[PDB]
Design an enzyme around this catalytic site. Structure first.
Site, short mmCIF file in Angstrom:
data_model
loop_
_atom_site.label_atom_id
_atom_site.label_comp_id
_atom_site.label_asym_id
_atom_site.label_seq_id
_atom_site.Cartn_x
_atom_site.Cartn_y
_atom_site.Cartn_z
N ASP A 93 0.86 -1.18 0.00
CA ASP A 93 0.00 0.00 0.00
C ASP A 93 0.91 1.24 0.00
O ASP A 93 1.05 1.91 1.02
CB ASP A 93 -0.93 0.00 1.23
CG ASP A 93 -2.07 1.02 1.12
OD1 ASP A 93 -2.19 1.67 0.06
OD2 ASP A 93 -2.82 1.18 2.12
N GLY A 186 -9.55 9.37 6.71
CA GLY A 186 -9.04 10.67 6.28
C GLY A 186 -7.58 10.89 6.58
O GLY A 186 -6.97 11.88 6.15
N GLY A 189 -2.43 7.41 4.09
CA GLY A 189 -1.44 8.00 3.20
C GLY A 189 -0.54 8.98 3.92
O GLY A 189 0.49 9.37 3.38
C1 LIG Z 1 -12.65 3.84 -2.40
N1 LIG Z 1 -11.48 3.93 -1.57
C2 LIG Z 1 -11.75 3.37 -0.24
C3 LIG Z 1 -10.51 3.47 0.65
N2 LIG Z 1 -9.97 4.85 0.68
C4 LIG Z 1 -9.58 5.57 1.75
O1 LIG Z 1 -9.06 6.68 1.58
C5 LIG Z 1 -9.73 4.97 3.15
C6 LIG Z 1 -9.55 6.04 4.23
N3 LIG Z 1 -9.20 5.49 5.53
C7 LIG Z 1 -8.28 6.19 6.27
O2 LIG Z 1 -7.93 7.33 5.96
C8 LIG Z 1 -7.68 5.50 7.46
C9 LIG Z 1 -7.96 4.29 7.89
C10 LIG Z 1 -7.39 3.66 9.09
C11 LIG Z 1 -6.00 3.58 9.19
C12 LIG Z 1 -5.41 2.96 10.28
CL1 LIG Z 1 -3.66 2.89 10.38
C13 LIG Z 1 -6.16 2.40 11.28
C14 LIG Z 1 -7.55 2.45 11.19
C15 LIG Z 1 -8.18 3.08 10.11
N4 LIG Z 1 -9.59 2.91 9.93
C16 LIG Z 1 -10.43 1.94 10.30
N5 LIG Z 1 -11.66 2.33 10.14
N6 LIG Z 1 -11.57 3.60 9.66
N7 LIG Z 1 -10.34 3.96 9.52
C17 LIG Z 1 -10.77 6.88 4.32
N8 LIG Z 1 -10.75 8.16 4.06
C18 LIG Z 1 -12.06 8.59 4.16
C19 LIG Z 1 -12.35 10.01 3.87
C20 LIG Z 1 -11.32 10.83 3.42
C21 LIG Z 1 -11.56 12.15 3.08
C22 LIG Z 1 -12.85 12.68 3.17
N9 LIG Z 1 -13.08 14.02 2.87
C23 LIG Z 1 -14.28 14.67 3.04
O3 LIG Z 1 -14.34 15.90 2.89
C24 LIG Z 1 -15.37 13.87 3.52
C25 LIG Z 1 -15.20 12.51 3.83
O4 LIG Z 1 -16.17 11.75 4.34
C26 LIG Z 1 -13.90 11.87 3.66
C27 LIG Z 1 -13.63 10.54 4.00
C28 LIG Z 1 -12.84 7.47 4.50
CL2 LIG Z 1 -14.51 7.30 4.82
N10 LIG Z 1 -12.01 6.41 4.60
C29 LIG Z 1 -9.83 5.45 -0.67
C30 LIG Z 1 -11.09 5.32 -1.44
#
Ligand SMILES: CN1CCN(C(=O)C[C@H](NC(=O)/C=C/c2cc(Cl)ccc2-n2cnnn2)c2nc(-c3ccc4[nH]c(=O)cc(O)c4c3)c(Cl)[nH]2)CC1
Length: 238
Positions: A93, A186, A189
């Site tokens: 990743d 959020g 990365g």
């Molecule tokens: C289609 N593909 C799916 C995966 N992905 C993502 O970007 C997935 C990403 N998840 C993370 O940023 C972190 C995860 C994580 C990491 C660790 Cl080490 C431990 C536990 C974790 N988690 C366990 N359950 N939740 N988190 C994540 N970002 C958002 C996010 C980001 C920006 C956003 N901006 C807005 O203005 C409004 C939003 O609503 C908004 C939501 C969401 Cl929802 N999920 C890319 C796209």
């Protein structure tokens, strides 16, 4: 960031906010400056992103409210996703963004050092995860860049915590046995920055976890030391 605290301006000058423009402009993910035209981030961030043209990289930002239509940004020339990447839970990743212009280094924006091959043995004691992500499972993108200090966890320990998954040596885990401080939606990365011998090193990239800050569910991060030759291959190509 769950159980975190507001960062101060200039605390994490390598941290960036990556915004997508489609359908509407919003924060997508975090990343780290590693060179004058290089941002290191997570591969899973680009699921569905068809082209670099919809991406905007903002550096020197404490608060998302500093971002408006007149705020300067870096265009993305290229999205480099590791060839072996399939999904966050399976590893690899990692991704690089080649910027259309050069980052001018200063007190607000500068690179973090990559970890050394001779430091894969050293034990980091001062580790921090940062981002604008949710503070709870059903929340929203935070305005202010948050920070949280978390302990590194051995692979053996992380493997026990994730039955049914394969925790490889290309992954690095961080969390308190009792939970309470972790990355969330959020934050992915973004960096897991560790201070060693008065120098910050990019030890990890936020990748995945089962929920946010649950007890005996540490965050899973890309183990940057294991991808230094891959980064050099893509960034130092002749
Ligand atoms: C289609 N593909 C799916 C995966 N992905 C993502 O970007 C997935 C990403 N998840 C993370 O940023 C972190 C995860 C994580 C990491 C660790 Cl080490 C431990 C536990 C974790 N988690 C366990 N359950 N939740 N988190 C994540 N970002 C958002 C996010 C980001 C920006 C956003 N901006 C807005 O203005 C409004 C939003 O609503 C908004 C939501 C969401 Cl929802 N999920 C890319 C796209």
């Amino acid at each position: 960031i769950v159980g975190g605290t507001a960062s101060v301006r200039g605390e994490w000058p390598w941290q960036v906010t990556l915004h997508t423009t489609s359908p509407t402009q919003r924060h997508l993910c975090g990343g780290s400056i590693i060179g004058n035209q290089w941002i290191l981030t997570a591969a899973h961030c680009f699921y569905g992103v068809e082209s670099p043209k919809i991406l905007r990289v903002y550096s020197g930002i404490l608060n998302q409210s500093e971002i408006k239509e007149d705020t300067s940004f870096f265009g993305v020339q290229e999205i480099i996703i590791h060839d072996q990447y399939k999904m966050a839970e399976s590893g690899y990743d990692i991704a690089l963004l080649k910027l259309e212009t050069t980052v001018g280094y200063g007190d607000s924006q500068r690179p973090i050092c990559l970890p050394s091959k001779g430091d894969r043995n050293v034990i980091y004691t001062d580790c921090w995860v940062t981002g604008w992500g949710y503070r709870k499972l059903r929340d929203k993108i935070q305005n202010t860049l948050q920070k949280a200090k978390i302990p590194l966890v051995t692979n053996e320990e992380c493997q026990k915590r994730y039955r049914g998954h394969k925790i490889t040596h290309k992954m690095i885990c961080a969390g308190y046995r009792e939970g309470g401080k972790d990355a969330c939606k959020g934050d992915s990365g973004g960096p897991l920055s560790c201070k060693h011998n008065e120098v910050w090193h990019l030890v990890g990239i936020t990748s995945w976890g089962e929920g946010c800050a649950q007890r005996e569910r540490p965050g899973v991060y890309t183990n940057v030391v294991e991808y230094v030759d891959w980064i050099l291959e893509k960034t130092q190509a002749v």
